Amino acid sequence: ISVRGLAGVENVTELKKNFNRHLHFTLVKDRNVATPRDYYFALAHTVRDHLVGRWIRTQQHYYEKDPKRIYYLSLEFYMGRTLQNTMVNLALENACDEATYQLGLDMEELEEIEEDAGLGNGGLGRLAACFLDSMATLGLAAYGYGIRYEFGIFNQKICGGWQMEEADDWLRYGNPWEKARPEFTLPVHFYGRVEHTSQGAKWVDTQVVLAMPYDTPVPGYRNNVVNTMRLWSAKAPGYIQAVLDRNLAENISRVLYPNDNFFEGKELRLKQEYFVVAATLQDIIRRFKSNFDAFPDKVAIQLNDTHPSLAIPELMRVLVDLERLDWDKAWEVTVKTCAYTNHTVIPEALERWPVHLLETLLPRHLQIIYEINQRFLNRVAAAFPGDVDRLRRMSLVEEGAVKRINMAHLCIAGSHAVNGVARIHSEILKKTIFKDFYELEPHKFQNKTNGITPRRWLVLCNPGLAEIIAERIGEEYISDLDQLRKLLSYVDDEAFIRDVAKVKQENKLKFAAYLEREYKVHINPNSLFDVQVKRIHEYKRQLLNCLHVITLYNRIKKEPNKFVVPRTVMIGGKAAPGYHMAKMIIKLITAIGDVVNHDPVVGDRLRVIFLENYRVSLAEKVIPAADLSEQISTAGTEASGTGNMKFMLNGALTIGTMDGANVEMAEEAGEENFFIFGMRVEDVDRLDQRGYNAQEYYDRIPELRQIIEQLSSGFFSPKQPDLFKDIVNMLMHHDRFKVFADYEEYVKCQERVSALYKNPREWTRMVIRNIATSGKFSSDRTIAQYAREIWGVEPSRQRLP
Amino acid sequence: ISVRGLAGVENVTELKKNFNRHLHFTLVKDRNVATPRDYYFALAHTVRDHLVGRWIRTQQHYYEKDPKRIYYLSLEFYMGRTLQNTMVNLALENACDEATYQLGLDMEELEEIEEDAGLGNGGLGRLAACFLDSMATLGLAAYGYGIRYEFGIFNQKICGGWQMEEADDWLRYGNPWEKARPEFTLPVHFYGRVEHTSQGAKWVDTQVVLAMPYDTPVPGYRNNVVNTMRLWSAKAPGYIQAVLDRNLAENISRVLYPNDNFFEGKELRLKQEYFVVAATLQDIIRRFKSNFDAFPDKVAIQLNDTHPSLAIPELMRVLVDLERLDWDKAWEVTVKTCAYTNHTVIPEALERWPVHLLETLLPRHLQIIYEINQRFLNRVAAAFPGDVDRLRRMSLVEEGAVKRINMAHLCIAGSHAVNGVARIHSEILKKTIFKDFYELEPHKFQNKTNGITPRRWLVLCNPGLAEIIAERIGEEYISDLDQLRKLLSYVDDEAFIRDVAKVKQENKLKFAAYLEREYKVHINPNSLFDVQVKRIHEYKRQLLNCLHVITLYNRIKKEPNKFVVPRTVMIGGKAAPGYHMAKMIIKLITAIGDVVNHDPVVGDRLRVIFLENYRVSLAEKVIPAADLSEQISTAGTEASGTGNMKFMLNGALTIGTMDGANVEMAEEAGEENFFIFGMRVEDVDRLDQRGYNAQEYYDRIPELRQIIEQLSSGFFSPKQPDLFKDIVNMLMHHDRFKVFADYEEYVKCQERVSALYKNPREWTRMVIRNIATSGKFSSDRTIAQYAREIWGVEPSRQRLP
Ligand SMILES: *Cc1c(COP(=O)(O)O)cnc(C)c1O
Ligand SMILES: *Cc1c(COP(=O)(O)O)cnc(C)c1O
């Protein structure tokens, strides 16, 4: 594969040398006792060495050049593995492949040893990871800042068809990429009280929690740029208990909260948020000094959701309390420095911290928040005199049994730019959700449609597809994905049609081999791979997919002799621990497979399997092997989505609603090349207006009725007939996401999917039309937009020495 | 200095190269931002690389050769720093000194950056450290096994004259010597219950705590041998709390219990003891397999006190329960494998675990302990028919309100050899303490007089003394200390007399510079350095030293014009957190200095200072600068001592009682070259027989009376007159260590010390007579004895390729 680079003779000689050097000096092993794991580490250290030169030169270059610096604050960085990605971006894949081969090793076997850096829940976390990659590839002096969770997203195990949660001990064998920096440790304060003296406020009597930075290299695509991702680790500042009690403060960075789009309100989570903000901003203020009028010209702080929103009052605290800037100048600086990115409209995702909890944990911040609110509302009152309810709606403070602070409101008030993550989402922010904020400051609202990196999500996971594409158009598309459009010229090319189809079958055979090897699960390779992989939530409607699967099963039993395109339906994703419904849903999926997968009448004509522990590395295996991409969220619920983009970039056809980025993907490729179905936002609203009555659908659709009765009677749970009563009850009477309402259109749409799959040539030509138009969804495009429209810096693909 | 080795041109070139390589690749720094700390680490990694080749070859050699293996189980390993020691044993000191010099660095400045591996309390821990060094130098296939405490002995701070305890975060900047081995992690079980089936007992329903090994290299003196010290680290095997709760099991290896010679009975301590035993023995059984009749021929398990005593029932558990050996054969194997080393006779040091606590935590072990006891007592009854009280005295089980298990009794019953740590101590074990065990099995009891390593304790800490010695007798003494005897030939050599005196003054100027630099404390360089450094306990009698200091002060005030040899009295050591008296004593020391050090009449004629945070690295600084070594424990209380040996090896004259190894040191050098004083064990016994009445001494000694009244009235605590009432009360009515009884002889003896110090020539000639006869106290001699008399292996100084 030519996109994998050259295997120079000297380069390969040096690689083997250093591989052996590390096995000896770093791992202290001989080839007599060395295990594949040792071999993976020897290679990892060898590859890591290649990053050091550029890593130091890059940061040095930024110091010499002094460009505006971008600080991307996020509570999650879903990075995945680093070995292949590092090799790809440094052009060392083939060389390492050859070197390890000469040493009698299978580099791919070694790559499977690496642990995912799963410091993210799903989309939001992964976007930050793709962003770091694009910001590096775009030559930006960007700094990712987050927290180094000791345990990332829990490793999911399926036991008895039920999800089981296990600690994700990802640092067990160490992390060869990060560089601990105990020397740059900073103090973070909690609790305490405020003293207002003759020099102003003073935050005193606080408990200290030290923040230890760990820096990880972020390589751009072959431009010799290596940026940094800084993750903070919590460190403590009779006798035995006191030493043991050091655990309490160090628990702050222990584990990533596994909630997806759901606000909890745990004090430990709030501490984690402030912890990353306080430390990060100390780093920022100091770097800046090595005056404050030019702060926004040299500093950009991007908030990934409201998680690090505390950076607004924190920046104010620093400038006013410690730097002695007058409130007004400080605020001008703050707003021009901060920008906020909203990721969802679902109300239960919004962060509204009880004022009492903020008053106790961060007394000085609450005071600053109240002051920010007064002046902000004062502005609203001056723009809309007499509009009292607007004041109540716009307020950062929410009244109720428990007074709270709306963090989204704080972010809008404290940032010069606010953006949605897809056109439809960004429009609704201005239309509904923040309509009032939009009317006050229209110029603040923007859109930055999400994207995925073509490196990890194409060249890395699909070397075969990337090769045949390069064969025709060169390698330039790799960091210029819009060039994929030149592929529309091959819709009638018999060679390309053959190859696209060939690559997809190879990926499917590979994924089949993976499942056979790791889980002993056998799937039919000559079946349509229908895949829905994403976090398990009601708004994503894995239940709608379940209804369809059962429909296919019942239709086969009713007319056995009737041919149907064979399908292997794969659903994967994690349910948040404690979310009862999401876990009942995972159980229904395995429960359906228990019947379906063992019916002799059905045989290998239909198979339903649940992909265990869906994570970044699994996404890289299954997505390139998918035929149909399921993106069936209820219209108006999925802000953007990114998994949809990955499936489009990898040769799968999409079946979905006009929601999130699905809309822009259909527009890019042409609605005729997308399997669009069901309600549109407007239709959902009309149902809401008159009230959603699931009974009507049940009453009017005999096939749906049959499935509800099978679930109800215990057809899919013979030993425990009433096992799914809650799913049934929710569907019939408390379904906020109208599953039944899109049932008919969905089943009909799937019929068309099968129809097209029956025609291999047309299936593939439509696929080509999809890949050829996925270009807009590369994160390089998104980041360039952030750079020019929000940060105020010009991106550049120019190489460093 | 010639004992420091050669500075080869190529060697120096390569060192600098690798130093720079590590600064770049390992530390990811440039010389623009590098700090001395970075420089220390760059050198440390560079030096560590030199150990790897031999480390792998040595272990490989032991595998090929298959010699009997020695497993030294200890709960403490007071290692101190590793950089200089590594350089010394590999002959790289001068080369590294030159290399770093050429790089513009002061290697000694860099050495001060290293953190002590203070995983020990005092003597017992340090002996294990010196033993590892000697076992390596003696070519033994020896393996040190312990626990990797996250926090070693607390760092002591003196605040307001009071000791303050701070966590000893020694791994904060990492440990460049150890090699983590997560791949060799083993499971350790706790709690649970026993199931007696048809295949015997089965330990089930236990909670698991994983033991992660960390291996540290142990270099022998220039023989190319590099053994291993294995330290185990505890690892865990709604959702958030469960992840946080992983801390509980990991707390097992968190911090070293700071008690010196005092049994507590904390369950966490018992868990730590079993943790090291279970893991260590798993390693031992496995290694052995890669049959059991030859186990004792291939395995030696040395127990450093009763801390790892659980290895006896644990070995039995393994052989009977898991290996299916009949009880009798298993026991024969066990006893022949285990040997026990007793370190103290003080009753409050003995480990007597409540049976209920053992029954709960290790149910199967208690059962085995009871079975061991029955059969053992059965043997006693058969050897002494009708002697019922002997049975009660020898029993492993102790009756009382709370039934307990005597671990010392378990160790004697389960080992083929039992030894004291000095001749006097070993004799009393046979005479009193274990008189009954001795009568049953006389052949079991031995003596292994302690020793210290001449490498760390001479060549390392006193390069000057080691140089002048080498100038006359060569370097052979370094690993053959008995050769120091050839120095008796220079008692009249004017050159040697000049040089010994010169070296001592250089060490004193250096220690003075240290105190000035680090603590801003100024000491008179032309004063007698009177030093007592050791853990703070009543039996060590720092209080006796205090009484003398006050005597000197009162005598100066009474006769100001009377010349007295100027003295800088230095007392240092840590008091166990919670030991009220030991801490009151530290306060009295600083309290005396507060008066003495500020009396204008006294001036620089007498100074009392408390050396803060006494630890291995401090011992290396102060001992070589000491004139008088204080070893004044009450006769019969200090089993051996090792600090005394260090002072003798380094040119200090000793003032002490006929206790522990003091006795053998006087015998080696000649009592006329030692300042021996006070009661002998026999005299203590007679006082005990009639009852110790401190009042008598108070009544008959006017000078002592004066001091007690000064303490009582508040002369040394004006702001709090009653501050020392407890010390006074204890001395007058509850002194178990008869301080007053040795007061007169002690003050008189100190008078003779001053008399001799007035004659520099004779002082030095007597010193020479001391250094020349310290040879017997090198740990190489002790270990060789252990090897031939207990382990059954022949030591060897032979070099490896
Ligand atoms: C891309 C990605 C996501 C996001 O998928 P959506 O379907 O947009 O929610 C979630 N998890 C992982 C492992 C991903 O790689
Ligand atoms: C040698 C040593 C000891 C033992 O000293 P003694 O006076 O025998 O009790 C204690 N602590 C340290 C730091 C040592 O080096």
mmCIF file of C-alpha atoms and ligand atoms in Angstrom, chain A residues 78 121-123 126 452 457 533-535 539-540 614-616 619 623 631 638 640-644 646, ligand 1:
data_model
loop_
_atom_site.group_PDB
_atom_site.id
_atom_site.type_symbol
_atom_site.label_atom_id
_atom_site.label_comp_id
_atom_site.label_asym_id
_atom_site.label_seq_id
_atom_site.Cartn_x
_atom_site.Cartn_y
_atom_site.Cartn_z
ATOM 1 C CA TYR A 78 -11.483 10.104 23.170
ATOM 2 C CA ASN A 121 -17.916 8.927 26.392
ATOM 3 C CA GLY A 122 -18.768 9.330 22.729
ATOM 4 C CA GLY A 123 -19.180 12.090 20.155
ATOM 5 C CA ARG A 126 -14.041 12.011 19.912
ATOM 6 C CA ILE A 452 -13.925 13.600 11.570
ATOM 7 C CA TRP A 457 -10.971 7.533 9.951
ATOM 8 C CA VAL A 533 -22.952 1.648 16.802
ATOM 9 C CA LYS A 534 -23.248 4.589 19.211
ATOM 10 C CA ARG A 535 -24.030 5.169 22.876
ATOM 11 C CA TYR A 539 -33.275 9.352 21.421
ATOM 12 C CA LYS A 540 -30.939 7.273 19.250
ATOM 13 C CA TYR A 614 -17.899 -0.501 21.456
ATOM 14 C CA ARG A 615 -14.999 1.957 21.543
ATOM 15 C CA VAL A 616 -12.745 3.923 19.193
ATOM 16 C CA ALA A 619 -15.162 1.598 15.521
ATOM 17 C CA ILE A 623 -17.214 0.796 10.390
ATOM 18 C CA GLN A 631 -28.582 6.947 11.967
ATOM 19 C CA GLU A 638 -29.206 14.465 17.483
ATOM 20 C CA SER A 640 -24.896 16.592 14.644
ATOM 21 C CA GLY A 641 -23.449 13.120 14.953
ATOM 22 C CA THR A 642 -19.997 12.078 13.693
ATOM 23 C CA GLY A 643 -20.408 8.334 13.437
ATOM 24 C CA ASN A 644 -22.614 8.994 10.436
ATOM 25 C CA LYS A 646 -17.319 7.877 9.432
HETATM 26 C C1 LIG C 1 -17.472 8.607 16.404
HETATM 27 C C2 LIG C 1 -17.774 7.889 17.768
HETATM 28 C C3 LIG C 1 -18.941 8.170 18.483
HETATM 29 C C4 LIG C 1 -20.045 9.087 17.930
HETATM 30 O O1 LIG C 1 -21.020 8.291 17.222
HETATM 31 P P1 LIG C 1 -22.504 8.928 16.946
HETATM 32 O O2 LIG C 1 -23.287 7.857 16.284
HETATM 33 O O3 LIG C 1 -22.377 10.235 16.278
HETATM 34 O O4 LIG C 1 -23.131 9.242 18.355
HETATM 35 C C5 LIG C 1 -19.211 7.485 19.636
HETATM 36 N N1 LIG C 1 -18.354 6.528 20.108
HETATM 37 C C6 LIG C 1 -17.213 6.221 19.422
HETATM 38 C C7 LIG C 1 -16.400 5.022 19.913
HETATM 39 C C8 LIG C 1 -16.906 6.899 18.249
HETATM 40 O O5 LIG C 1 -15.764 6.585 17.540
#
